[model samples]
Target: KKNGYAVDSSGKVSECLLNNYCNNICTKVYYATSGYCCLLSCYCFGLDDDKAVLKIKDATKSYCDVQII
Candidate 1:
């Protein structure tokens, strides 16, 4: 991981995290150069270990996302 970004097992870029968003990750452009992907969450930053507690919350929220249906 470098430049505030990291790549997961599925070749997806995670912002400020690593080795987590291997499958169900979402991405967006936030800067002029490049952006990042998240674990398909409202606030994906919580999905990373940097915030384990919030990660759990977001993880559960992911399951409740209305978009899935």
Candidate 2:
């Protein structure tokens, strides 16, 4: 399995808000088993494949303007 991460555009989203959004997007949208804030980015785990990670990366970039890392 692979882990994916998306960063908040500098300070566009606050830490608290990022925490909630990350958890929701990762678990609900990406179907990740775990998600959390790590510094300036949200990390998601249990993706199980690269395709899933890429999908979330694109979704986050388009919807939230967050960059994948």
Candidate 3:
């Protein structure tokens, strides 16, 4: 199973911003292995399934609407 999270930025998210956000915030703070942008949203991948989900949930509460995918 792939541990992943998708974040919706209400279409305001840009590729450049997403890249930076994913690489910096998601990878560093959320313990993501990798991250990318899709459909103007942020997507992060990780090795730890449960930890990824919990971290994404914490991100959602603090920032955007993030969901485990």
Candidate 4:
């Protein structure tokens, strides 16, 4: 159990997680049975997986005109 919901240990986030979207943006993700609040743009497993991260990488390619972050 994690984040007030019930889920298995299968690591299925989309299937067993509740997303809190603030203003149409994914601000926090609550898991099953536990109050685990996680940010969408966060570092995981030694890397930050977020939109800003994508923007920075895209900027270096010169193909993406939207320099976010």
Candidate that would win on TM-score: 2
Model 1, 1-69: lDDT tens per residue? Answer: 112222343324443344233222423322112222334422332233222222334544454333332
Q: CA lDDT, every prediction?
A: 0.31, 0.49, 0.46, 0.23
Per-residue lDDT for 1-69 in model 4, tens only? 101111223333333133232211222332211121233221111121222222124323332222221
Candidate 2 lDDT by residue in tens digits, 1-69? 556663333323213355666766666545556556654456666444333232345555354434343
Candidate scoring better on TM-score of 1 and 3: 3
Pairs in steric clash, model 4: 1-32, 2-31, 2-32, 2-33, 2-34, 3-33, 3-34, 5-32, 5-33
Better-scoring candidate (lDDT), 2 or 4: 2
Task: Name the weakest run of 10 consecutive residues (lDDT summed) in model 3.
Answer: 7-16
Model 1, global lDDT: 0.31
Q: Which wins on TM-score, candidate 1 or candidate 2?
A: 2
Question: What is the TM-score (0 to 1) of candidate 1?
Answer: 0.17
TM-scores of all candidate predictions against the true structure: 0.17, 0.44, 0.42, 0.16
